[PDB]
Structure formats: structure tokens, C-alpha cells
């Protein structure tokens, strides 16, 4: 995160939503659960933040 200031990008995208606290942990690659499987899925790759 520190080094984001040293990088250039062709674009920046941002996704936004509200979830239950316990479900926040599902917003990551390699996860399973109600959110991870049926609401919001991430690819097997890095995520900005």
C-alpha cells in the first residue's frame, strides 16, 4: 500500500457494497460462502486493496 504512490496505472476501478461484518472476510481470493459464491466473486489474482 505504501508503494502505491510509486506506481502508474492505465485505470483504477472501484467496487462498492454493504455486507454483514462477519461476511467482510469473504471479500478475498480463494474464499467460499454466501458472498464469495453467489454475490461477489474475485478471480485468482492480486487485488489492489
Amino acid at each position: 500500500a505504501t508503494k502505491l504512490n510509486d506506481l502508474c496505472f492505465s485505470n483504477v476501478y472501484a467496487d462498492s457494497f454493504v455486507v454483514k461484518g462477519d461476511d467482510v472476510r469473504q471479500i478475498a481470493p480463494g474464499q467460499t460462502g454466501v458472498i464469495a459464491d453467489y454475490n461477489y466473486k474475485l478471480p485468482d489474482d492480486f487485488m489492489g486493496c
Binding site: T2, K3, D6
Partner: protein
């Protein structure tokens, strides 16, 4: 590793974690060097065998007359001449048939 390019790890990735990525990449590459040099030693040994033979032939086919059959040519050895060649030696074997 994240990337084959060292700079694309070291530059952007957090310096702690980066050591893990770098260490892995280093190990990977070191293995190819060990493989490469091993094969080169083996190849070199084969060349020695060839060079040793060439030296023998020079002495016995050019600087003298060999009697051992088929060493300096199929026929009955009379003469030979060496020629320069790109990383090798070319012989002209003159024989009686």
C-alpha cells in the same frame, strides 16, 4: 513467483514479503546454472576424446606412415595432409587400392 522479472517483484512488493518471492526466484534460477555447467563438463569430455584422437592421427598419418588398418583410411596408407577448419581438423587421406 509473481513474475520472472526481478524488478517487478522488488519494486512494488513490500520489502519483507519480497524476500520470499525473491528467494524463490533465486533458487529457481540457480538450478538452471547448475544444470548448464554440468552438461558443459560432459560435452567437454567428449571433445577431449576427439582432440586426443586427432592429435594421434596427426602424428601417425601425416608425420609418418601408419600400418594399422583403417586408421588413416580404408586402403593402404601412402600419404596425408591436414587442412585448417572452423573448430576442427580436416584430413586428406591418400591410399593405394
Amino acid at each position: 513467483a509473481i513474475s520472472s522479472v526481478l524488478n517487478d517483484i522488488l519494486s512494488r512488493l513490500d520489502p519483507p514479503e519480497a524476500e520470499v518471492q525473491i528467494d524463490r526466484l533465486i533458487t529457481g534460477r540457480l538450478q538452471s546454472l547448475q544444470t548448464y555447467v554440468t552438461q558443459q563438463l560432459i560435452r567437454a569430455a567428449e571433445i577431449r576424446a576427439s582432440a586426443n584422437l586427432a592429435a594421434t592421427k596427426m602424428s601417425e598419418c601425416v608425420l609418418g606412415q601408419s600400418k594399422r588398418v583403417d586408421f588413416c583410411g580404408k586402403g593402404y596408407h601412402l600419404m596425408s595432409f591436414p587442412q585448417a577448419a572452423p573448430h576442427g581438423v580436416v584430413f586428406l587421406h591418400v591410399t593405394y587400392v
